[PDB]
Each structure stands twice: as structure tokens, then as C-alpha cells.
Design an enzyme around this catalytic site. Structure first.
Site, PDB file in Angstrom:
ATOM      1  N   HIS A  77       0.775  -1.289  -0.074  1.00 48.62           N
ATOM      2  CA  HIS A  77      -0.066   0.018   0.005  1.00 48.62           C
ATOM      3  C   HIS A  77       0.848   1.182  -0.052  1.00 48.62           C
ATOM      4  O   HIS A  77       0.450   2.428  -0.367  1.00 48.62           O
ATOM      5  CB  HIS A  77      -1.206   0.118   0.875  1.00 48.62           C
ATOM      6  N   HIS A 120       6.601   6.704   5.942  1.00 48.32           N
ATOM      7  CA  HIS A 120       6.159   6.320   4.599  1.00 48.32           C
ATOM      8  C   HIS A 120       5.483   7.630   4.003  1.00 48.32           C
ATOM      9  O   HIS A 120       5.492   8.532   4.569  1.00 48.32           O
ATOM     10  CB  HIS A 120       5.150   5.104   4.719  1.00 48.32           C
ATOM     11  N   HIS A 131       2.522   9.032   0.912  1.00 47.02           N
ATOM     12  CA  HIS A 131       1.181   9.028   0.295  1.00 47.02           C
ATOM     13  C   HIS A 131       1.107   9.835  -0.972  1.00 47.02           C
ATOM     14  O   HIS A 131       1.853  11.039  -0.690  1.00 47.02           O
ATOM     15  CB  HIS A 131      -0.168   9.661   0.762  1.00 47.02           C
ATOM     16  N   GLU A 146      -2.788  13.779   1.941  1.00 49.13           N
ATOM     17  CA  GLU A 146      -4.156  13.372   2.474  1.00 49.13           C
ATOM     18  C   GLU A 146      -4.965  14.657   3.280  1.00 49.13           C
ATOM     19  O   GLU A 146      -5.893  14.936   2.885  1.00 49.13           O
ATOM     20  CB  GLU A 146      -3.482  12.362   3.610  1.00 49.13           C
ATOM     21  N   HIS A 159       4.652  10.803   6.436  1.00 47.98           N
ATOM     22  CA  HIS A 159       4.197  10.657   7.693  1.00 47.98           C
ATOM     23  C   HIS A 159       5.408   9.744   8.519  1.00 47.98           C
ATOM     24  O   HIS A 159       5.721   8.708   8.074  1.00 47.98           O
ATOM     25  CB  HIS A 159       2.818   9.492   7.507  1.00 47.98           C
ATOM     26  N   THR A 162      -4.824   6.681   8.783  1.00 46.26           N
ATOM     27  CA  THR A 162      -5.316   6.793   7.730  1.00 46.26           C
ATOM     28  C   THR A 162      -5.711   5.627   6.632  1.00 46.26           C
ATOM     29  O   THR A 162      -6.474   5.651   5.565  1.00 46.26           O
ATOM     30  CB  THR A 162      -5.009   8.160   6.844  1.00 46.26           C
TER      31      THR A 162
HETATM   32 CO   LIG Z   1       0.294   7.500   6.241  1.00 46.65          CO
END
Ligand SMILES: [Co+2]
Length: 258
Positions: free
Chosen positions: A62, A92, A94, A104, A117, A196
Site C-alpha cells: 500500500h 512512509h 502517500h 491526505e 508520515h 489513515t
Molecule cells: Co500515512
């Protein structure tokens, strides 16, 4: 089937397996800057990452995580709105399929190209697993990335991506210093929220930095080359692994600055 970011298993379907998705303290949210309250009682954030020990990088299907040794107080976060010490466990990102999306959290509805994050867990709980069951178990530092100039400190991460292209792959990743990913200013917004991705536990104190870092187009391009799928399965590029903004509900966003 299992969650992801596609049309059939995407964020809009998560509530069927994780009912907390429609909870009261879900993340991310839109940060309305004119409604955030300046709180003079919030202390400056204290980031001590000079003793950080990275161990590995992993494609979990992911995103990609860089993992750190959290067996001792090596890389910690304290101060700000926190009580106690929070140990870094992993970072990590996004990101989007295009430069106009990917973050996000949004600022006055503005979406950034990506969001970093840095995940930390409260030492009073003894381990990560116990910390996720508590209202104050985690602290996540979120940093926005915009496309412009390359970020020197990010290059070591960009360069190992080829070796963890598909789900389940990992690579030794020692001696990476996460201080190369911080903006100049530590000014921030803070609100109580959740992870999230599933299991979407509401155990997070979010600390969202006001100043984004810049990355080059070529750097973000390499992120988009990763795959959601495992080796030998049809190729699905890892892009748009972000959850849209959730209702603020009964919450107030506080600012450390004016
Ligand atoms: Co995150």
C-alpha cells in the site's frame, strides 16, 4: 476482498470491514486556516533524531515503509501538544498519479503532490501494538511535498525503490538520517485523529507542519513506478494511495503560530 485504493476496494468501501471508518475522530481532514485557533500554550516541538537507526525498507502493498530500531529512545518526538516521549518506528508517503493530488491533509482545500508520515508511539505503552489501543498512543508528524527543487536528503530513498518494486519485497536500509526530510520551520497545526489506512484506529495526535518540503518531478516520478501487486501478478502501479478528507465533527484544529 482486501482493501486498497481501487474502485472496488477503495476508501468508500472500508466501512464494511472497519466500521470505525465513519467514526468521530477520523483522518485526514481539510485544514481551514482561518478557523484554526492559535494556542499560545502549545510548546515548540522537540525532534531528537541524531541517534536514529534505520534498518529496512519494505513494500507492504500500500506504500513503502522505512523502519527504525525502536528498542530504545534513539529517535524521539516530544513537546508540542504531547505529554511523554514518542519513539519513531517508521516513515512512509502517500502520493498521487499527478502533481495536483497525493496529500491526505489539505490546506484551505489545496492538495499537495505527496505527504510524508513519520509515525511515533508513546513509550508509556511499552510497544506499538499496545499504543494503538490508546487515545494518546501515537503521534504522527505529517509534512507536505510540493514539486520544485530536488531534495538531496530524499535521494537515497529514491534510489532503492527499484529493489522493492512489488508487494512483500524488502531491502536493508541502514544509516539513513531522517533529519534530511525536515523543513526549516517547525510551526504546525494539531488535532486529535486516526490512522489513515485500516484499521483506522483513533489513536493519533496529528502534528501537521505548515512549511512543505520541495522535491523534483524526477523524484516523485520514481514513486509512481512502484507496484501494489506482488511479483508475477498483473501490474498495477502504486499511485493515488491517499484517503480523502473526513468530516471534522466535534474537533478543533489548533495552531502553534499566528
Ligand atoms: Co500515512
Amino acid at each position: 476482498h482486501h482493501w486498497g485504493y481501487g474502485k472496488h476496494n477503495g476508501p468508500e468501501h472500508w466501512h464494511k470491514d472497519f466500521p470505525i471508518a465513519k467514526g468521530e475522530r477520523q483522518s485526514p481532514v481539510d485544514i481551514d486556516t482561518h478557523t484554526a485557533k492559535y494556542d499560545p500554550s502549545l510548546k515548540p516541538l522537540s525532534v531528537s533524531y541524531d541517534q536514529a537507526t534505520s534498518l529496512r525498507i519494505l513494500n507492504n502493498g500500500h506504500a513503502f515503509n522505512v523502519e527504525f530500531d525502536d528498542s530504545q529512545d534513539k529517535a524521539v518526538l516530544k513537546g508540542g501538544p504531547l505529554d511523554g516521549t514518542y519513539r519513531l518506528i517508521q516513515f512512509h508517503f502517500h502520493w498521487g498519479s499527478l502533481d495536483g493530488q497525493g496529500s491526505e491533509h489539505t490546506v484551505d482545500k489545496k492538495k499537495y503532490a505527496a505527504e510524508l508520515h513519520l509515525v511515533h508511539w508513546n513509550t508509556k505503552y511499552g510497544d506499538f501494538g499496545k499504543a494503538v489501543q490508546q487515545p494518546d498512543g501515537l503521534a504522527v508528524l505529517g509534512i507536505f511535498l510540493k514539486v520544485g527543487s530536488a531534495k538531496p536528503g530524499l535521494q537515497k530513498v529514491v534510489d532503492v525503490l527499484d529493489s522493492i518494486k512489488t508487494k512483500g519485497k524488502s531491502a536493508d536500509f541502514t544509516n539513513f538520517d531522517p533529519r534530511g526530510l525536515l523543513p526549516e520551520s517547525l510551526d504546525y497545526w494539531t488535532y486529535p485523529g486516526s490512522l489513515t489506512t485500516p484499521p483506522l484506529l483513533e489513536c493519533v495526535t496529528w502534528i501537521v507542519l505548515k512549511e512543505p518540503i520541495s522535491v523534483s518531478s524526477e523524484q516523485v516520478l520514481k514513486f509512481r513506478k512502484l507496484n501494489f501487486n506482488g511479483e508475477g501478478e498483473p501490474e498495477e502501479l502504486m499511485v493515488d494511495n491517499w484517503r480523502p478528507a473526513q468530516p471534522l465533527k466535534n474537533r478543533q484544529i489548533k495552531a502553534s503560530f499566528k
